[PDB]
Structure 1
Amino acid sequence: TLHKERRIGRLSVLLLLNEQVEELERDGWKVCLGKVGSMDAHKVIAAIETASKKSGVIQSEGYRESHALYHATMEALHGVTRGEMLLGSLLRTVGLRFAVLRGNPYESEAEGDWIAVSLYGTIGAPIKGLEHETFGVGINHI
């Protein structure tokens, strides 16, 4: 399994809801931090893609490391969208802080890099004030 004190999701989460970047970077973690506000999902997917190539998290060349992040993002959007992966076209909108990790979370080195996308903030109507919290975490091999 994974290590009792280096569980990548639990980290990516504990970080996102606590103001950090430094202690984690000192271990194997290629970390990334973010914020997107949109009523389009294709917007959130694009932001995350950029911040991930922009900081050290994902190789900008090729499809491989990309394809990992796309599906890891979808997955996180699930917890967020809770059933239909739609925002504005369902008359809703999001204020999100995204956190993204990469490193090996398992005991054996043969396990390679794994990517975690965490998403936290709020979902509600286009008019600010009308919202509750939302939450999505996704995990893929990279």
Structure 2
Amino acid sequence: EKSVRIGRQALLLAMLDEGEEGAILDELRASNWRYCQGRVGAMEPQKIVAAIETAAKRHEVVDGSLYRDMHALYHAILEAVHGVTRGQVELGDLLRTAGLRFAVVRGTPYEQPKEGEWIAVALYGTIGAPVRGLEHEAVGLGINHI
């Protein structure tokens, strides 16, 4: 069964402590899949989207001038943000903020070759009141064909 958990990889990259992630990186290298990681502190959801788009482009995971790529990523991002926000994608507008780690992974996860590329966006972090220590954890995942 050649099939791979591309989401789980993204999530693991997002949640494991730096330096615990070695095997995942190794797998990605073998596979020769593109990926990136990053962090964002946000009281506005669009900041999250921006950070992710920016990161994806800078690390060459997506072609920023090619809409199909950016449409695919956009919607995967919203899917993840939804796991984090659980209903309303409002942060500041609802008196909360988030600090999040993110990761993106673009690959060919399925067994059949024709399935082609897919992208995964993962978010992990905390969400809470804009006060130190009044917070808890959150998670999200988005998957899209690309």
TM range (shorter): over 0.9
Equivalent residue for 1:58, pick from 38, 54, 62: 62
Which residues of structure 1 form unaligned runs of 5+?
A: none
Counterpart of 2:10? Answer: 12
Equivalent residue for 1:32, pick from 25, 32, 36: 36
Partner of 1:118, secondary structure, is: strand
- Give the partner amino acid of 1:52: A
Counterpart of 1:94? Answer: 98
Q: Distance in 2 between matches of 1:71 and 1:124?
A: 24
Q: Percent identity?
A: 58
Counterpart of 2:53? Answer: 49
Quote the offset at 1:27 in angstroms. Answer: 1.1
The two structures, once aligned, show a CA RMSD in angstroms of 1.4
Which residues of structure 2 form unaligned runs of 5+?
A: none
**1:91-133, Cα deviation, whole Å (9 max, x unpaired):** 0000000011000010011111100000001000011211000
Aligned pairs, number: 140
Contact 2:91 2:98 in 1 (8 A): yes
TM-score by length of 1: 0.93
TM-score by length of 2: 0.91
Quote the offset at 1:28 in angstroms. Answer: 2.8
The worse-fitting range, judged by mean Cα deviation, of 21-30 and 117-126 is: 21-30
Map 1:95-134 onto structure 2 (within 5 A).
Answer: 95-134=99-138
Contact 1:28 1:104 in 2 (8 A): no
Quote the offset at 1:2 in angstroms. Answer: 6.8
Contact 1:104 1:112 in 2 (8 A): yes
